[PDB]
Design a binder for this molecule. Sequence first.
Ligand SMILES: NC(=O)C1=CN([C@@H]2O[C@H](COP(=O)(O)OP(=O)(O)OC[C@H]3O[C@@H](n4cnc5c(N)ncnc54)[C@H](OP(=O)(O)O)[C@@H]3O)[C@@H](O)[C@H]2O)C=CC1
Ligand SMILES: [Zn+2]
Lengths: 342, 114, 84, 146, 126, 135, 207, 96
Amino acid sequence: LHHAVIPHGKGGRSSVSGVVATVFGATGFLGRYVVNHLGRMGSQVIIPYRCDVYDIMHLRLMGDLGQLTFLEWDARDKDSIRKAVQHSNVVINLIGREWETRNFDFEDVFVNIPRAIAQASKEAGVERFIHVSHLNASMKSSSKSLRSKAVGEKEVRSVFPEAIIIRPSDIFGREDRFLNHFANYRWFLAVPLVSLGFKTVKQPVYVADVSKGIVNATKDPDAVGKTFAFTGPNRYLLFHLVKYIFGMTHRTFIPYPLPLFVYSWIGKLFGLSPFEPWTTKDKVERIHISDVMPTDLPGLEDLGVQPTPLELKSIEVLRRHRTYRWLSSEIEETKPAKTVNY
Amino acid sequence: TSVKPIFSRDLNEAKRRVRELYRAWYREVPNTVHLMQLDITVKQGRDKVREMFMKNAHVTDPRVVDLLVIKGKMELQETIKVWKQRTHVMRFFHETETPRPKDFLSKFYMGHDP
Amino acid sequence: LGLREIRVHLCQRSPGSQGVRDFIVQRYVELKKAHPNLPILIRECSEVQPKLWARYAFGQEKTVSLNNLSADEVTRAMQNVLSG
Amino acid sequence: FAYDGLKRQRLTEPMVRNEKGLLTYTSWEDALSRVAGMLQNFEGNAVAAIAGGLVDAEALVALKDLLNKVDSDNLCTEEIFPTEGAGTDLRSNYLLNTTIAGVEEADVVLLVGTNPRFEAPLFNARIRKSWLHNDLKVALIGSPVD
Amino acid sequence: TQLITVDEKLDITTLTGVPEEHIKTRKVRIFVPARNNMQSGVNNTKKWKMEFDTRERWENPLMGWASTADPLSNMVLTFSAKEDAIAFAEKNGWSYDVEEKKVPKPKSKSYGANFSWNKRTRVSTK
Amino acid sequence: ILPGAAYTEKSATYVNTEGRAQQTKVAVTPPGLAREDWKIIRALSEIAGITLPYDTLDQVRNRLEEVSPNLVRYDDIEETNYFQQASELAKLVNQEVLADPLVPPQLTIKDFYMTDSISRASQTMAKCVKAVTEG
Amino acid sequence: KRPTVRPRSDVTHKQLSAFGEYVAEILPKYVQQVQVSCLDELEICIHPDGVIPTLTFLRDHTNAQFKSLADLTAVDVPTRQNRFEIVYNLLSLRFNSRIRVKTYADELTPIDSIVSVHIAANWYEREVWDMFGVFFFNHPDLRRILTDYGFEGHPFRKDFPLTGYVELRYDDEVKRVVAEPVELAQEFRKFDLNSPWEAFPAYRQPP
Amino acid sequence: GVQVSPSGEKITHTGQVYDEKDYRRVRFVDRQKEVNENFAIDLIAQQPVNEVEHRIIACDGGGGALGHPKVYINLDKETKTGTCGYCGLQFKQHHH
Ligand SMILES: NC(=O)C1=CN([C@@H]2O[C@H](COP(=O)(O)OP(=O)(O)OC[C@H]3O[C@@H](n4cnc5c(N)ncnc54)[C@H](OP(=O)(O)O)[C@@H]3O)[C@@H](O)[C@H]2O)C=CC1
Ligand SMILES: [Zn+2]
């Protein structure tokens, strides 16, 4: 270890961790938690951003002086990546997107960009490269995002064979697109589900556990070159999950069945939004795709994390949707969701 | 061996006071998880009350016990009234403090601290 | 058995340890002639209760007090240690 | 003035040999695991330790207890003291029983195989103080020095 | 309000807000600070001091300053006697290793010794 | 290689030619990942099937008291009065001196500045030797 | 006459000494070690059982109308077994004179409140409690005054570190302000500044 | 002068520069490293020796109360030159 990387201190905001990370995608739902957990134990975080400097403020405070170093980059410009990974010992590609744009395709974000980042990280002397694929990812899935993600992790491993690949499930938090989505269906007065939610399984995990797992894989020497499956402890059926949601939200739950060949058309329409669409055909298909069973893959308890069940961390997400009549309602008033094995 | 007593001339009356205080806290927890909109259950709060109480179970001087009860009543006042926000209440749970292990060997691997 | 060391603790000016000093001056010489390659350590200190630590193989130590004895009890305890 | 050495040629990280036989940097876990394996596969009279001079009693006693628990008693120093006779069984045989302040009460001092000047100056300084004030008479069996 | 029979050792830890860490894992030092040999003044060798164990200090990467996670790194208390310091330490629940006071020994001194007929005190440097 | 600590970096008992146990105190912490020596050895034991009882320093010093209680009486010197017996015993070895003129290793000051590693790693002591040898 | 030194009048010394004799012989049950300073200031030290009687006498008595409580302080001296030196500085508008009354307390040795005498002491006694840990009796509302709402410790105690034991920040994970153990980027630098040469031989402490 | 290192970083008048493998050079990415190009050592070397006809000369710097405390410098050693301790001006005994 270089004399400036030896860890010193007790693991506080002003300590040293020995970690010099370059986090691609820090301006997202998960990147902010990752950067918080990194700057919390005194590590250097290099945060390349394409967005406006006004959208990195919430990050500017989650690290001591000099621990956060921001940079302007572009996915197409390869030098923008070399300059970022030029001094790191870790790289964390969280780049992703739940919809395609005028200028970017699922392929572009899930295959090429990770592949270039990995080429540069390898050529630059990086020791670790953490990639975040999906749990349900496969070259044989109906959704295009999952096919692209599987191809992308294949390429990342063909360019960086020691790349830690992390495969989480539908993540839930405050700024998420899963519980807030299943809560905001209410604006349409009813919940359209395929097969009435049955036949579908969801094993969701809290984002803080995922960030802890990433930050611990940063410095866990038994994790190099391994795949992980970050999944929650309990499996649910989409029906009972959404019912528990509307219970915490205390809204009226009117579920009706809906075949997928019209729900996907609905999703296309909604996706035509030139802004951030409220839903998409790919987000639809990603829903209603059952959740793979652990199938021997390592996990959070092997990284050093005890998963947090949804029944403890749902209200801090779903109290924002309640009305004045139900705000103060406690957690125990809501009947928990049925758990399954399948 | 002879000193002035604050309130209790023996440990049993101090224990009576401690029990009164435990009852007050046990009865208050629900009202303040409702009011402060805390994102915890009512059982976690009472477990935390019991833990903070046991934190000072080893005392035997009635004067230390009387002062601890005074401080606990001060805090219970600050909480019954909403002078303190959910921040100060959740300070008790230390949700962010990375828990230092009691394993000699881990303490050895990270740092020179005993 | 597997005996490795004998280390004697005692005081320099105290009654209780009076039996160990007489024992030493009269018989440590002969005993250390008999067993020449066996450490028999005497570390006399101040205001220390006298003891006899016999440590056998694989770091396992014994301890039998010697407070307010004669030299003969000391001899018998030491030979009991030696023999085992 | 030799505190400038604590800022140079220092061991700051556990090292270990690689396949090529070169010293590389590694962790505490790895090196201690290697050493613990090697220690597990050995027993008495095949293990041994050596102290160097700047060592502390705590490390000495801990290493002695360890080696004892693996049955070894070959614990040795680098400095040669004769065990022929009473050896270390008696402190009178390897101490300065006439403590340094005893040179002030003495009338005659005899130096054998010492250059206390370069070897323990403050002792030589005390001998000179006595030579000055208390008319101490010194003698020396050894090579002639100042 | 008459007197009470406590009959135990004082303990103030629970009233000082001091964490378990900085009470169990702390070794106090009680001593009379030694005279600084760059000076012949003896006025700081009178009052007993209480100093805590030293802990880590690591350079800050940004500037290069010394950092600490030790609040008591610069804690120093002043007492008039040894028993007072021992009592304060016991009370607050700390562990202490005391160090007796070092007084110089009285020394015979004569200006005539520098001028002698037969002794070695005779100096050649007036 | 297990990097240990120096005397300015740890608390330790050192005994002098008289038997006066004297304790060092911590002024600095060891550099990088360097550590106290007994700490290293206790961790080594725990990693092996062995495990030494003491997890702290007071326990190590209780062990010291067990082995030899002269190592804890700080700043004190314990009288020892058993030379007669050692001499009676040592009057029985059949070895004779060699008649070689016994001379010390430090015969001048240029053989004084560098004797241990802390000294051989000092540029200042090298300046000193280079001054003395030159003139 | 000298322009740098401070003009000194003994008349005030005499006045305050006579009044101190007055107080001492009119309240023997409580008074200890009356004294007056080179600068003209009267200091009456007492047993804490005498707090309320002394202050009430000095407020209500005719030749002593100290009915304005200027300040109320404490002073930690860890050496003595009773650390806290509670101080009552007072003022007489009728005589244009001041006076200071002192007691002593301990961590586990509380005293009586004087809000029955001077209502100005409510907040001052709350401050003493919050800062040093001294508990007062028969206080209407004794709580914290200056410290945070969940603060552990009494910061003005000499044994309390200047920088404290905890430190606050904002955590996006929980979306709250949290308290973490202290960790500084630059450690406070302790300067040993006391000169080793006796400076005032009038205060020399004989061994 | 301001010499560069194998990494391009400039070496300050203190001899400081980050090693090529040091991660602490990200702070200078898309930014610059502030150095002072006017090294005072070279400058004070560029100044000449002020001769004098007296064995003991004083130096207040310049401006009187705008310089440094007045020190007196001996100039007996004709091989050496006396250097003020505050400024770096050199003086030499003209007649030796
Ligand atoms: N439900 C979830 O959140 C799940 C997440 N994951 C994985 O986690 C990762 C992040 O999830 P999340 O953080 O929620 O995604 P977000 O949309 O919340 O943020 C993703 C990041 O991707 C960056 N990004 C996307 N496209 C580009 C681009 N073309 N050029 C530059 N930056 C780009 C964005 O930067 P900006 O916003 O500034 O453009 C943003 O910071 C994704 O890779 C996803 O596959 C896995 C399973 C489920
Ligand atoms: Zn000048």
